[PDB]
Symmetry: D3
Subunit: 159 residues, 6 copies
């Protein structure tokens, strides 16, 4: 029935992302975890890496489908027959950008409804960017990542 | 059958609220528009008045059920077999309070998932309180309220 | 001849308000400092008291006219032939409310253009309410108020 | 010997407050937990009740002294020979008010330095007011309050 | 009499900018629409392009003058005998930066008064950046731009 | 007794930084002013320059020690036996990032307590970035910098 899309760069997927997509799967029949292919900011992991890490970290969720996309998110959501756009809501500065993005997406595809989900307090203060920056400077980010992601990030930063 | 609850004081229900509940009905099979008694807010309209205004203003939506309540939110949602709690997200200062509410409601009922919807730009700068204050100075608030609500607010202040 | 109106509760007028209206008079030919009755805020000073305090505190500014009003803002501005509505912008939480006000006032009078001015850093962290609360505990608020206002606040709390 | 004061209404003291004062005692030699009378907030508990609840809830901390006061903050801090004023920082809307408070307190006592501490994520979304409102609807607030405070809030609402 | 300056990068000018400058022209006798020449972020359109697009899109407003500048804004405003600085106010995150900018401009030129105008709800959630990003990824931004700007942006992205 | 660290990039140190570190020295027995060595954003002044400018501008404060560091801040604070982390709090957008940073630092080193100090109203609206940008475009930033820093910045921008 209800098809939802949860897009992002997921570079890499964090426990914050797992919390959001898990909540989405309890609400909607099918959830597409949609990984943006060619972000303008050179992602740390390749698209194939981000997709494979996210598949592994969500494999326990029956109704998640991990797919990469390079179109405008709204164009891809339209072609996937999604009517729900999942966005994670952490802090107020996130909120301001999300409101601009949501109004633009509504202009581009009014039949796509943006829904904002709220993560656990546990993940309410992290981001892929902060995690990467901490790990790059020899900080412990084990608590923030799925184990498979933690292993790949160590491997990535070792070289 | 996905059951969602949209709680609030709705004193009175505005077009902003109609926007949110309409989006909700497009997403979920059954939506309970749930009117909190909220005596501490000293509402302008009684709970029975607010319930009847919202019933009339949502009557065109097949899958809306308007109910009044004075229970703890989490208990009322459990008792209505809802697993989704809808809140409208206007501006940053609302957002902060909503996070406290949602984290409190999650603590009390972890299977009740809060979802925030965003209203049209048309209603992004109004509130029940602002409309009431405009009407208190006899300003034209027809654009912001359902007809039946507009009349009742007029009659109330006359 | 450009006419601007600077409305507010001004209970009491502070140096922050003096800063804003002074900037306004440097920009526009005639500035109406317009004191809202605001009975719902239960002001400390009566409208007549607030009007006289502001008259005295702005008397050095040639092109300020102090007036009290209880009308709808948009009507009073239309009736004063103003096309500019001045508001002071302090912090983010004020900003959110001001946008709702300005969008409401624009809806009711689209030719009334809201302009926001920014006060000196010196007054960017005070408000009428904060000063009153300090004075209620006999703290020194001479730095934040015009002399005549300081005296009246003293006399009031004595 | 560094003396710090942690003022607030503490109506009632929550685990969020316990978190802050505990962090304070790890940083400063002596911490005065100072309970403002705040009659304008119409507190649920009397000053004497709030003082006794906080005394009991902080009794395990050797270097906490609980005191009630109705003075101007700056005077009470001067009179207690404190040079540090502790405030907890939750969210953006608190932050704005705290800056106004700290700049006012600095004006009145420039040697009183405000320091903001950040509570655990566990308490980052609660407040005395939110807990009271939950308890008013008989929701379970045991997780948010010290045992003695939880009992007193129960007894009060019974 | 009263000379006002409305500076920005206008890369490209949007309907949000037209709304602001139009409101400014109803308030002040002469409005200089001032286009910053060499922003550090390589603008999509050249200065000559931005100026010509803005001239065309404001030609109906009698008391607008479109000019490019490369000095510090305050230095240019001083040399132009402007005493009013028009800033558009969209959302709270804009506001924080605008307050820092306005206090700096006041330090640099105290006789230049910053005034913040508020755009229509219609344009309260867009920016040149978001519009460009949407258009670059094959989204429809026709509603946000003057027709002449829409034509030039399509031409720009076709190559 | 109590050792506090005040880290940053200090590129260059401003009067806002002097205000904060001065308040810190009145509160804590020893204050390490810790200058991050290799920020990802190519700092205007070298690490040796930033350290020498900061030493000169704080030389009047007896209990300040200026040191450079290249580790993760928390790792350096741990190795320096600091238990207080001084952060300066200017505006709400600062606050949101500071909360994420403080929670991360608490995860990485729970015995390091973050404390937020508030600067004078005089410096509540400036940053190293805005000062640099103004100076680079021929604006007067004399009021915002220690004299030694003002001299070095002019020298830097002359070439
Ligand atoms: C209906 C209330 C009274 O129920 C509560 O339990 C409660 C508890 C604490 C604060 C506020 C509330 C209210 N609330 C909860 N969630 C949505 C709402 C309402 F404002 F729409
Ligand atoms: C003067 C009031 C009562 O007039 C109104 O119409 C109104 C309508 C709704 C909210 C608030 C208001 C007030 N207001 C409007 N604009 C500025 C102000 C004032 F707060 F300065
Ligand atoms: C205790 C009060 C009454 O003391 C004042 O002087 C005052 C003055 C103005 C506003 C608010 C206050 C209160 N306050 C100051 N600093 C912390 C607090 C308190 F809220 F914890």
């Amino acid at each position: 029935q209800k098809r939802a899309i949860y897009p992002g760069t997921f570079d890499p997927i964090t426990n914050g992302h797992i919390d959001i997509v898990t909540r989405a799967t309890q609400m909607f029949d099918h959830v597409i975890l949609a990984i943006a292919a060619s972000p303008s900011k050179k992602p740390m992991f390749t698209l194939e890496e981000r997709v494979a890490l996210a598949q592994q970290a969500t494999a326990h969720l029956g109704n998640v489908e991990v797919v990469g996309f390079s179109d405008l998110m709204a164009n891809f959501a339209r072609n996937q027959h999604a009517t729900v756009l999942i966005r994670g809501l952490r802090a107020v500065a996130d909120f301001e950008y999300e409101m601009q993005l949501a109004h633009m997406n509504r202009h581009l595809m009014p039949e796509l409804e943006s829904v904002f989900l709220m993560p656990s307090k546990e993940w309410s203060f992290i981001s892929s960017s902060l995690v990467k920056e901490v790990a790059r400077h020899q900080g412990d980010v084990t608590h923030f990542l799925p184990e498979n992601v933690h292993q790949a990030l160590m491997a990535k930063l070792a070289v």
